[PDB]
Amino acid sequence: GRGFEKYWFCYGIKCYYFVMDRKTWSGCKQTCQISSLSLLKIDNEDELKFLKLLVPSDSYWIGLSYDNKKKDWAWINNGPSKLALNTMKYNIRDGGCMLLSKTRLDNDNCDKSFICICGKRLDKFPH
Amino acid sequence: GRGFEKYWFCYGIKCYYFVMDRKTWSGCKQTCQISSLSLLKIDNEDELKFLKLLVPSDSYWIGLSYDNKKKDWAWINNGPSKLALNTMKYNIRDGGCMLLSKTRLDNDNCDKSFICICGKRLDKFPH
Incomplete structure (x- = not known):
């Protein structure tokens, strides 16, 4: 269940929620999920521009990882x-999971603990 | 009816909306109202702390002004x-309306044009 921050934000058709504890990429992926959110997926450059503008200054896990099958x-x-x-x-030797900071996307060790940013679209309904 | 940013945020029971064009204090007050919002009222020190934390860096008209009669x-x-x-x-000779920046509350000429920050509770319903 819930240990999120009490603030959140929205842009267009998508909102953004913040876990209180820093977690490994996998642990964030699963924390977003138990709450019907998902580790954040970034849809375009416009959206990226906004998050770098609006997020508090820190480093955030987002739902992007290197896939050796693809x-x-x-x-x-x-x-x-x-x-x-x-x-x-992106050098995968230096990390296979992506974070968001105010400055850029960077790859990093999937085992390091960063803030989870979970996204959920406003048109997302159970099925 | 409209001319708002695409983004907004919330904290506990209150969300925050941003007009695109800078306006005079009175113009902000009326623009917020046209949309059944209200030029922002800050409830406590906790909330002010949060807004100084999350608002982009700029100066914002909020629903606070000096009252002659009071x-x-x-x-x-x-x-x-x-x-x-x-x-x-707050020297009223320097301005009779309040704005929010990241640093502090300050007073200023009610005729200057600043960003409107409009608030609306989640438990606020027509009557």
């Missing part, structure tokens, strides 16, 4: 995105 | 608050 960085659950990643920017 | 600073529509102001720090 041979590429992939949004969780095959999630589709229009965010172009320059994958040369 | 002989005091007063929140719009007789709004109740538990935010203690030290009123000795």
Whole structure:
């Protein structure tokens, strides 16, 4: 259940929620999930511009990880995105999971503990 | 009816909306109202702490102005608050309306144009 911050924000059709405890990438993925949210997927450059603008200054796990079957960085659950990643920017030797900071996307050790940012669209309903 | 930013935020029981164009204090007050919002009232020190933390960096008209008849600073529509102001720090000769920045509350010419921050509780329903 719930140990989230009491603030949250929205942009367009998507809101953004913050776990209180820092967690490993996997632990964040699962914490977003038990609450019907999902570790955050970033849909485009517009959205990225806004989050870097609006998030408090820190480093946040987001739902993007390197996938050795696809041979590429992939949004969780095959999630589709229009965010172009320059994958040369990212050395998988230095980390296979993505964080958001105010300054950039960076890859990092999946075992380090960062703030989880979970997203949920406003048109997301149980099925 | 509209001319708002696409983004907004919430804390506990209250959300926060941003007008796109800078306006005079009175214009902010009326723009918030047109949309059944209200130029923002700050309820306590906890809430002020949070807003200084999450608002982009700029200066914002909020629903606080100096009242001749009360002989005091007063929140719009007789709004109740538990935010203690030290009123000795506001010279009314320098301005009779309040704005919020990241640093502090300050008073300023009610005719300057600043960003409107409109508040609305989640338990606020037509009547």
